[PDB]
């Protein structure tokens with residue numbers, strides 16, 4: 441896989457963010473994770489965590505997997521990096537997202553994320569508390 445440039449347009453919630461990619465606005469849905477909705481427990485904390493990462497970064501990047509690049513709603517499907525740190529993994533490691541929506545052929549980072557989740561669960565963080 442490879443990282444590509446993007447710029448933040450606006451944070452939306454824990455697992456969606458609006459970026460400019462190849463000069464066009466797009467909503468991205470983060471691969472392999474599920475944050476709580478804003479109205480649910482940990483939802484506001486997941487939104488705030490993603491927003492801080494993507495806003496404070498000097499450089500945001502998108503990395504598509506090998507399969508589908510957009511979902512049925514027209515959202516981009518990608519791993520998002522903020523100054524080289526993967527948002528998807530960081531949410532899981534903090535217990536602010538579960539590993540979820542693991543479809544075959546866009547699952548390159550599945551085991552990296554499952555290791556983060558085991559660590560968050562052992563530490564009883566957030567969703568796992």
Ligand SMILES: Cc1cn([C@H]2C[C@H](OP(=O)(O)O)[C@@H](COP(=O)(O)O)O2)c(=O)[nH]c1=O
Pocket residue numbers: 469470471472473474511512517541543
């Ligand atoms: C993360 C991801 C979600 N989706 C779809 C499945 C779910 O469909 P349904 O809307 O029918 O439930 C929805 C979950 O997104 P949200 O968690 O953003 O609601 O997005 C994919 O198709 N591919 C993906 O990789």
Ligand SMILES: [Ca+2]
Pocket residue numbers: 455474475476477
């Ligand atoms: Ca969600």
